[PDB]
Design a protein around this nucleic acid. Sequence first.
RNA 1: CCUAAAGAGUAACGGAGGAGUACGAAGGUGCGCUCAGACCGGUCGGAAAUCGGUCGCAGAGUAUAAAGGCAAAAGCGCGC
RNA 2: GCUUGACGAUCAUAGAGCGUUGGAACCACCUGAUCCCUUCCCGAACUCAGAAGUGAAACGACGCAUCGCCGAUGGUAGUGUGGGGUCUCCCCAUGUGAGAGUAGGUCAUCGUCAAGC
Lengths: 137, 115, 47, 76, 176, 190
Amino acid sequence: MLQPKRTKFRKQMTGHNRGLAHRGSKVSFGEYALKATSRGRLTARQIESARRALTRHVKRGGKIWIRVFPDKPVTKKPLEVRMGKGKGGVEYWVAQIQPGKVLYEIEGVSEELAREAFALAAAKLPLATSFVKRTVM
Amino acid sequence: SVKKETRLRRARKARLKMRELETVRLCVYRSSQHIYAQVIAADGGKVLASASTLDKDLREGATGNIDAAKKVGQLVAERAKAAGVTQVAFDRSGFKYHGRVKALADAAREGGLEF
Amino acid sequence: MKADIHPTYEAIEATCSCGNVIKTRSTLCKPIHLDVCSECHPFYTGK
Amino acid sequence: TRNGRDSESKRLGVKLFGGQAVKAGNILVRQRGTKFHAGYGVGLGKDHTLFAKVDGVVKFETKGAFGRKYVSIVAA
Amino acid sequence: RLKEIYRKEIAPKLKEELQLANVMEVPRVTKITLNMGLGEAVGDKKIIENAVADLEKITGQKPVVTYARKSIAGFKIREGWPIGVKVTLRSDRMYEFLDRLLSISLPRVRDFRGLNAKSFDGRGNYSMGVKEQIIFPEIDYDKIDALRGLDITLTTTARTDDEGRALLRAFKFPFR
Amino acid sequence: DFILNAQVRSDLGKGASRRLRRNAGLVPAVVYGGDKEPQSVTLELREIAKLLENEAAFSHVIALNVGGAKETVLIKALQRHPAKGFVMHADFLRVVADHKLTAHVPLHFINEEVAVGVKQAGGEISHTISEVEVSCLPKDLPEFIEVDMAKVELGQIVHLSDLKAPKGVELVQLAHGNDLAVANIHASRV
RNA sequence: CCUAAAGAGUAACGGAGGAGUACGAAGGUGCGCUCAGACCGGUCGGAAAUCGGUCGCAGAGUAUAAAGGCAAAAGCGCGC
RNA sequence: GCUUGACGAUCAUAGAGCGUUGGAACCACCUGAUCCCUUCCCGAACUCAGAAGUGAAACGACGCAUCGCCGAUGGUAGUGUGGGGUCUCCCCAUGUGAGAGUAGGUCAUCGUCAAGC
Ligand SMILES: [Mg+2]
Ligand SMILES: [Mg+2]
Ligand SMILES: [Mg+2]
Ligand SMILES: [Mg+2]
Ligand SMILES: [Mg+2]
Ligand SMILES: [Mg+2]
Ligand SMILES: [Mg+2]
Ligand SMILES: [Mg+2]
Ligand SMILES: [Mg+2]
Ligand SMILES: [Mg+2]
Ligand SMILES: [Mg+2]
Ligand SMILES: [Mg+2]
Ligand SMILES: [Mg+2]
Ligand SMILES: [Mg+2]
Ligand SMILES: [Mg+2]
Ligand SMILES: [Mg+2]
Ligand SMILES: [Mg+2]
Ligand SMILES: [Mg+2]
Ligand SMILES: [Mg+2]
Ligand SMILES: [Zn+2]
């Protein structure tokens, strides 16, 4: 479960998630990547659970990159608690995801073996995903 | 050099006050051989009157001591009058007001113009 | 140099037992007799 | 909750903009520190307030070294 | 004195030993500063004037006390506390001190075959160390407090330490 | 064959460009370089995308037929939709016989199965960069820089300075005092 | 200080910190000077004291929170 | 018309780095501390009296884009007004329009006065 070692502030506002990803949308390191097509946010329990499913399938050589870091704290107000009286305590960490963002990368394996490995990871994530290779530009 | 760049910073406070007030400025410059004096009009753009030990009546050889500055200081006062200037400010340009520059100023006071 | 805050500083003389005299102005106020100098030191000559 | 505090707002900012007619003694900019520096015909208060010493027009020019911003008064 | 010795023959010989072209670029020695860092006297304050009183005799010039630039409690000091004294010697005073150092006191300290020639910084300045002050004259052995470690520094207009060593090869420095 | 057909574009802006992609199936483009003013053109989407699956698309010179005129250009930059990936805008750099030009050239790794660090010590290859920035006259622009890793011991690092470029080709990054690693051999992950 | 939507203003048992003093010099003026830090050499201290040199330009400082300022330094020293 | 010095306009397209180069005059270094003045010590700095030396350093001039700094066109993001949708978000008509990146540029341009050439 990824989270920052320390933060300047404990809490954050909900904010909004708009636009597309013109930054972080290319295959920078590996040769095949899993891209995001819908927007949403990954909760650092899905990111871990999709990494376990991906490396277990290959389990022979290869290298794997994670390109998403969950660094936005979210809170929940405990049960049977009225409205108000402060802001709730931090529960888990999430990463904001925009269409076009690259999530995982891999190399050192076959082109086909990458497809079964990313299909196992894509089933644990709450958004639509796509498979892309690396182009010169 | 460090010596010259430190002095040019010593001269900034007085030169930036004479512009806020917008007054005529009498600027003195000293070197190891000669001493100079200028009258700067109102904002730095123009020079009205000037004198130094380089003119063809002080080229004699004792051009770098106290009594060489006295002749220059009272010489610019004569030339200042022809320009119809009076009530100027003195600008030591960062040099200490003690020696040659003080003799050049003290001649200008008796030379006719008032600070 | 300031005035009246430093020790008196004077020419004096120095003599070494090796038959050596060197002029050196200092603050002894009294000539002194030496025993070893650069003319007679072992590790200045090669011992 | 251990947070509910704030302070009254001080109403700082540019009072007269560029091209406007000023009278002597008018207050031009209210500041903390010197975000605008005093130019021609402009004085500085003891809390970094820019006021007018002459009459004319607000200028709002940036010039010189250090890349400062100057408020001055020019003839109307 | 050594001042005459320098400009009469040291300069012309050193001009050719380095293939120098201009007489202005020949290396020269500018100032000598000694100091002595008194880690003690934090709880005494009484040896400071003893340390001061010692150092006019050695140099013929009044020293001045230096204070702590910072607190740092590991050494149990506070900012603005007297930590050491220093002197600066220039022109004729340093030359006569230099003669008084080469052979009045240096040969007779206790020991040593010489001085190391690797004690040069990158810009041709040499600094050495003195364990016991009593190596100097005008401080007799029967009226002193605990022995204290004076320090010596040389500042030269030498661009690098190669010719700075050559200059200190003149003045006949005992280099090993 | 590296041929493109383009027509002169007169209507500019966001509203006019969004119409080209939506209705006509075209793509806006720019032709700058040489000593001439930039010219705005448009070209078919299915034709620019057909040229882009050649390996040496960006490392080879193209003859862009604009209307009835012809000229020699090279793909400089390329804009793509972040999610869908199709090309949205492309700009060409004109080619002059006496003028240096920079380009991105892919790397071919050869005889990997012959690598010493793999058969003997059981290592693994990891390409770090698959392209380089070059600077050469257009007469000797290479299609690909061939990097050889037959004689690479386990744990060896291959830098820019270790490979060979053709006649009159510079590696740019190497010239700027920064020779970043190309590939390596490392022990298996686990 | 943020919320606060690039003039001002703007709420919640919204998110974060401080105050209920200090100073006869820590005020005025004239004159003078630049920091933190890194590295090299140097007697005991030694990663870090005092010293010399090079680099650096504000990463220092500002009686006291944070924001906005600071070369005519608003920072540091001395005389009156 | 050129060189030097002083004062300004303008604050990197004007800066940094590298190389060459100037001493007849100016400038700097320079010689000395009697005298004016000075150092919480010291003629280092400040000051004074000068004329044997040297352009070594500093400074000025002339070169190079290596770093820095400027920087299009085109496209993209955002956005006021009116209208839509599958409405946590986007699309259409109209007006507006960056930031970053690319082609490329830059080793400045002026005014007054004084001595010379
Ligand atoms: Mg909310
Ligand atoms: Mg972004
Ligand atoms: Mg001042
Ligand atoms: Mg609150
Ligand atoms: Mg609060
Ligand atoms: Mg409020
Ligand atoms: Mg006031
Ligand atoms: Mg529109
Ligand atoms: Mg508003
Ligand atoms: Mg507001
Ligand atoms: Mg209300
Ligand atoms: Mg409280
Ligand atoms: Mg204060
Ligand atoms: Mg130090
Ligand atoms: Mg200043
Ligand atoms: Mg001198
Ligand atoms: Mg545009
Ligand atoms: Mg636009
Ligand atoms: Mg732009
Ligand atoms: Zn002897």
